[PDB]
């Protein structure tokens, strides 16, 4: 029922998985801030990356599906009355991590959803396949709010799909690093990172 809804739904990574992903994120920043291919393109990133993305989530990482504001968000009730939503509540999932991105605003991870997980998914509003926004925020610039992460990921996918993917500029240990221009960086993983999580609601 509407009034019992959560603030939002999502895949909340397990402690072990959350920490794995948190670790892997900081390595991408440690290795990105020191990659010469990035040090030249600092004019288009700014006027140490871990510190730049100093606003990090304070608990476990999670992949948001539907912001609900306790039933009073747009479409909140309808998402909740879906048979997949009320049945997969409290069930455990295995998300795939596709790439890790870095813009001058936010740093995050991209999620590729299985057809079954996509049943839980509710400008960039156009052209791309569903669930393309699916992510995990790993950091934010001091003055940037986290919802920005979803739109940068879409901005990158409108680019790679656009053809402006741009050839490889750097080889990292976990995958090849690409540079899409306006301070946007992407690490496409040689082996996708499988991360465990639970589908549930966030309360207070």
């Amino acid at each position, epitope marked *: 029922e509407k009034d019992f809804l959560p*603030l*939002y739904f*999502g895949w909340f990574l397990t402690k072990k998985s959350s920490e794995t992903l948190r670790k892997a994120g900081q390595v991408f920043l440690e290795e990105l801030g020191n990659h010469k291919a990035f040090k030249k393109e600092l004019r288009h990133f700014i006027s140490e990356l871990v510190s730049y993305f*100093g*606003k990090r*989530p304070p608990g476990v990482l*999670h992949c*948001t599906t*539907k*912001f609900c*504001d306790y039933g*009073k*968000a*747009a479409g909140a009730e309808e998402y909740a009355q879906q048979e997949v939503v009320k049945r997969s509540y409290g069930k455990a999932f295995k998300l795939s991590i596709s790439a890790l991105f870095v813009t001058p605003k936010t740093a995050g991870a991209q999620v590729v959803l299985t057809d079954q997980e996509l049943q839980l998914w509710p400008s960039a509003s156009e052209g791309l396949p569903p669930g393309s926004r699916a992510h995990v*925020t790993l950091g934010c610039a*001091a*003055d940037v*709010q*986290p*919802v920005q992460t*979803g739109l940068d990921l879409l901005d990158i996918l409108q680019q790679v799909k656009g053809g402006s993917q741009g050839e490889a500029v750097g080889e990292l240990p976990r995958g090849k690093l690409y540079s899409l221009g306006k301070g946007r960086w992407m690490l496409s993983l040689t082996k996708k990172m499988e991360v465990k999580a639970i589908f549930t609601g*966030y309360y*207070g």
Partner: nanobody, 130 residues
Framework: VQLEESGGGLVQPGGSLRLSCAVS????????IGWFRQAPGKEREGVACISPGYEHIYYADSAKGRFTISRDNAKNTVYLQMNNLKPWDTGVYYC????????????????????????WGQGTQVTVSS
């Protein structure tokens, strides 16, 4: 539970105004505050926001550098310093309080969406002549 704005009125272009809300029955340690503007016929559009986590102070691109939001938690009053004001800022500036700041930021909500807020002030009328 009361948010009373104040400090609005007339000002010429380029002038400055400092709005103030006296939050009551709620505390700025638990609630983030959004300052909103409602101009004639437009919809409520967020100008600035301060959450209790202190690293969450945001500004709308229009007022990113002209305005400054702050709090004196001792006086549980929030402030909005507006510099180099233009007629396009004319509007009613309302003050909103939301206990899910910053939590919702990390779960798909935008600070400037006014729907998630929980309590709204009465609005102080601001007007930049011409």
């Amino acid at each position: 539970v009361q948010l009373e704005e104040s400090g609005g009125g007339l000002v010429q272009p380029g002038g400055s105004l400092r709005l103030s809300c006296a939050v009551s029955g709620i505390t700025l340690d638990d609630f983030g505050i959004g300052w909103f503007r409602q101009a004639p016929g437009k919809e409520r559009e967020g100008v600035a926001c301060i959450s209790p986590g202190y690293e969450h102070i945001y500004y709308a691109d229009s007022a990113k550098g002209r305005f400054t939001i702050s709090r004196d938690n001792a006086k549980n009053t929030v402030y909005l310093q507006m510099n180099n004001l233009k007629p396009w800022d004319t509007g009613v500036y309302y003050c909103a309080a939301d206990n899910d700041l910053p939590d919702r930021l990390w779960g798909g909500s935008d600070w400037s969406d006014p729907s998630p807020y929980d309590y709204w002030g009465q609005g102080t009328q601001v007007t930049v002549s011409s």
